[model samples]
Target: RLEDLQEELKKDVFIDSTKLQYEAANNVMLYSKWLNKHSSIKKEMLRIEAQKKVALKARLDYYSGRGDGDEFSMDRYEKSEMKTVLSADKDVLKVDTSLQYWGILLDFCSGALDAIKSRGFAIKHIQDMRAFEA
Candidate 1:
């Protein structure tokens, strides 16, 4: 009877356990991909933001009546154009836009890890009990 039950466990329970592990691995892999993509995009965004900051600084200096000497003087028209571009970037910096998606992704990864742990434990415990019976 023990042998029969053990065979059934190996055939049925083992398949389910393997499937659970596969699903968990897939979830983790997808999460990793999302992290990599976000990291790259965020890096580029930071580079652009740094340029925007420099432009904004120059615009501020011009508005404050600090004209660049002959070497780099910005005419009133150029200053106005800079102000328009700088205003667009200012709104982008003011709003935080990263947390909502990342929070959900983190939650998904955590849940997948828990599922993997629980199923692995179940498989091991069953195998151990089968050994104890023998």
Candidate 2:
């Protein structure tokens, strides 16, 4: 019975390592994708701002070109539109923050793996002592 428990304990050690490796790799992949997504969102925000500026400038030019001399000024609506456009994207750093959660999970799993390995060793020692006595 002690040997049987030892064998089962060995299996737990193997399974623990296997699960940790698998989950850790997946978390890394998730981190990679999160980085990519954050970068893309930043680029998108830059592109939107550039496009809005170009369009606003073009409108100003057209309005000021009218037959009579007039000044082209940005009204509240235009300013509000600009503000809305600039603030459209939110939580860009959220993906980065998520890495902390993933890291914590990996750390927990790694600790679990270590615990299982220690348990396996203890079980092996007990099994050996039982065999020696018998």
Against the reference, the lDDT scores of all candidates come to 0.48, 0.44
Candidate 1 lDDT by residue in tens digits, 22-112: 6445544544544554465566556655655665566466544574333333344464566454455443334223333343444443544
RMSD (CA, Å), candidate 1 to true, equals 13.9
Candidate 2 Cα misplacement greater than 4 A, ranges: 1-18, 63-134
lDDT of 2: 0.44
Q: Write the per-residue lDDT of candidate 2 for residues 2-78, one digit (tens) a residue.
A: 34434533443442333444543444444444345445545555665555555544544533342113544343345
Top-scoring candidate (lDDT): 1
Candidate No. with top TM-score? 1
Question: How close is every model to the real structure, measured as TM-score?
Answer: 0.38, 0.33
